[PDB]
Design a binder for this molecule. Structure first.
Ligand code: HPA
Length: 260
């Protein structure tokens, strides 16, 4: 089919550009972009130059913390009007290129945790309005009806909390609820999401994680909580606790990369 041939064409392109044997997918959300700096012998490509991909923004291959990583710095957002096929196309590419696991980070609003926290994601709730696997199943990639019981790979999660303790960074853990965006939530919406068991809320991740699961990729997800969700303070700006958290997240992801 159409999608599959794109997947293969973009995979060869990337192979030809020298994208050899990435072990890890790395999606750097809101201000972990910088960490793509520290990537060694980096192949750096603009999104606009990647066939079948286009302008969401860079894709970056090379070595980080001793591992082969395929990093997205700047990521597709559903609220920008990108379909769900295009949002998750980099995830199809990471699998088809041999990646074993995905590390997806993001910035989230805090329901059960407060600003400055880092929250390993233990599960998610998809409230985006859509599911990225709608359409014909991609048999080459996975089953029609994939099990989400273990989406945020419990082995990866244990590794993250060990690394966090051993390096003395506080690592919390909880449930992310994905919404579409791009408006922030009303306080009433935040009360319902709390009732539905969410600990944090943002505008990404869920669809990528679904496709990651379908593709058989293990997954690690971490939210930086950048602010109390609507209702828990009185306005939402200055979500720049992102900066004060920058250095802890960087060292954490690096030291996790070593151990997965
Ligand atoms: O409060 C929020 N809501 C949804 N997404 C977000 N990303 C950062 N903060 C938020």
């Amino acid at each position: 089919m159409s999608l599959l041939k794109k997947i293969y064409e973009t995979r060869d392109f990337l192979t030809a550009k020298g994208v050899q044997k990435p072990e890890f997918g790395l999606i750097l959300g809101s201000g972990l972009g910088e960490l793509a700096e520290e990537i060694e012998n980096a192949l750096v490509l603009n999104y606009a130059d990647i066939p079948n991909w286009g302008r969401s923004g860079k894709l970056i291959y090379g070595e980080l913390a001793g591992r082969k990583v395929l990093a997205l710095q700047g990521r597709f957002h559903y609220y920008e009007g990108n379909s769900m096929e295009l949002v998750t196309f980099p995830i199809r590419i990471m699998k088809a290129l041999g990646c074993q696991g995905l590390i997806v980070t993001n910035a989230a609003g805090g329901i059960g945790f407060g600003p400055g926290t880092l929250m390993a994601i233990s599960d998610h709730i998809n409230l985006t309005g859509a599911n990225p696997l709608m359409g014909e199943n991609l048999d080459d990639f996975g089953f029609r009806f994939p099990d989400m019981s273990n989406a945020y790979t419990a082995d990866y999660r244990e590794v993250a909390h060990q690394v966090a303790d051993k390096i003395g960074i506080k690592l919390d853990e909880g449930v992310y609820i994905g919404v579409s965006g791009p408006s922030y939530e009303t306080p009433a919406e935040i009360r319902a999401f709390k009732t539905l068991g969410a600990d944090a809320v943002g505008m990404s991740t869920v669809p990528e994680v679904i496709v990651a699961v379908h593709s058989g990729l293990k997954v690690l997800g971490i939210s930086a909580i950048t602010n109390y969700a609507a209702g828990f303070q009185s306005e939402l700006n200055v979500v720049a606790v992102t900066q004060q958290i920058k250095e802890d997240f960087k060292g954490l992801v690096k030291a996790i990369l070593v151990e997965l």
